[PDB]
Design an enzyme around this catalytic site. Structure first.
Site, short mmCIF file in Angstrom:
data_model
loop_
_atom_site.label_atom_id
_atom_site.label_comp_id
_atom_site.label_asym_id
_atom_site.label_seq_id
_atom_site.Cartn_x
_atom_site.Cartn_y
_atom_site.Cartn_z
N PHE A 29 -8.74 -6.32 2.59
CA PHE A 29 -8.30 -4.95 2.77
C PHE A 29 -8.40 -4.11 1.47
O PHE A 29 -8.88 -3.01 1.50
CB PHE A 29 -6.79 -4.99 3.27
CG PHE A 29 -6.28 -3.65 3.72
CD1 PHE A 29 -5.72 -2.72 2.83
CD2 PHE A 29 -6.35 -3.32 5.07
CE1 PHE A 29 -5.24 -1.49 3.29
CE2 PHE A 29 -5.86 -2.08 5.51
CZ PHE A 29 -5.32 -1.16 4.63
N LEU A 67 -8.95 4.35 2.13
CA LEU A 67 -9.86 5.07 1.23
C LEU A 67 -10.74 6.05 1.99
O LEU A 67 -11.34 5.72 3.02
CB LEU A 67 -10.79 4.03 0.68
CG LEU A 67 -11.83 4.68 -0.19
CD1 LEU A 67 -11.14 5.07 -1.48
CD2 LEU A 67 -12.95 3.69 -0.46
N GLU A 72 0.78 -1.20 0.00
CA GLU A 72 0.00 0.00 0.00
C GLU A 72 0.82 1.26 0.00
O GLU A 72 0.34 2.28 -0.46
CB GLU A 72 -0.91 0.03 1.23
CG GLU A 72 -2.00 -1.03 1.17
CD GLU A 72 -3.03 -0.83 0.10
OE1 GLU A 72 -3.79 -1.69 -0.22
OE2 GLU A 72 -3.00 0.33 -0.52
N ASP A 108 -5.97 6.80 -5.41
CA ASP A 108 -5.96 5.32 -5.61
C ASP A 108 -5.49 5.00 -6.98
O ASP A 108 -5.62 5.83 -7.86
CB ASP A 108 -7.49 4.79 -5.90
CG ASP A 108 -7.99 4.13 -4.70
OD1 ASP A 108 -8.45 3.04 -4.64
OD2 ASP A 108 -7.85 4.93 -3.69
N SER A 137 -12.61 -19.60 -6.78
CA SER A 137 -11.25 -19.66 -6.20
C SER A 137 -11.30 -19.97 -4.73
O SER A 137 -10.38 -20.57 -4.24
CB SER A 137 -10.45 -18.37 -6.25
OG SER A 137 -10.47 -17.73 -7.48
N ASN A 156 -6.95 -19.63 -11.44
CA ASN A 156 -8.31 -19.02 -11.37
C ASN A 156 -8.32 -17.57 -10.81
O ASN A 156 -9.05 -16.70 -11.25
CB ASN A 156 -9.23 -19.92 -10.49
CG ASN A 156 -10.67 -19.49 -10.66
OD1 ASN A 156 -11.25 -18.70 -9.87
ND2 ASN A 156 -11.20 -19.90 -11.78
#
EC number: 3.2.1.17
Length: 164
Positions: A104, A32, A11, A20, A117, A132
């Protein structure tokens, strides 16, 4: 390596409001603020989040505080989610970190939509699940990051993050 160090590699840390990869208003360690186009709406969310008048800028301290809340909320949401909990419980410690990472970045809802998945991870079909997972918007939009997370589920160790 642990969830905090892992996320912080993915991040980064920014002390001023930023956009972003998605163009959204964010601050700190991937916190965010709003999906709204106004810097003003973002500023307001910020001050609400911190409890002060920030003027678009926070301290390291405030950043890490937000980060601790966000990680806690991610784990708790996994635990509260009917689709996520079973997968979480089935996984080992390292792989558990990779699912937390997805949650997250994308939110409970988003991850809970990776039905096939999830099914494969539960079954411990590591190589199948990796192929996948790669078939998604997620991978196409943030390939280096997705690929780190994917290697993590594949291998069960921290090698994708050693480099970094």
């Amino acid at each position: 390596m642990n969830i905090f160090e892992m996320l912080r590699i993915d991040e980064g840390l920014r002390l001023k409001i930023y956009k972003d990869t998605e163009g959204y208003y964010t601050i700190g360690i991937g916190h965010l603020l709003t999906k709204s186009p106004s810097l003003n709406a973002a500023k307001s969310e910020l001050d609400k989040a911190i409890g002060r008048n920030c003027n678009g800028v926070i301290t390291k301290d405030e950043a890490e505080k937000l980060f601790n809340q966000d990680v806690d909320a991610a784990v708790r949401g996994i635990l509260r989610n009917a689709k996520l909990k079973p997968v979480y419980d089935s996984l080992d410690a390292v792989r558990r970190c990779a699912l937390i990472n997805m949650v997250f970045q994308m939110g409970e809802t988003g991850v809970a939509g990776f039905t096939n998945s999830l099914r494969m991870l539960q079954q411990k079909r590591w190589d199948e699940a990796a192929v996948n997972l790669a078939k998604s918007r997620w991978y196409n939009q943030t390939p280096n990051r997705a690929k780190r997370v994917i290697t993590t589920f594949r291998t069960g160790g921290w090698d994708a993050y050693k480099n970094l």
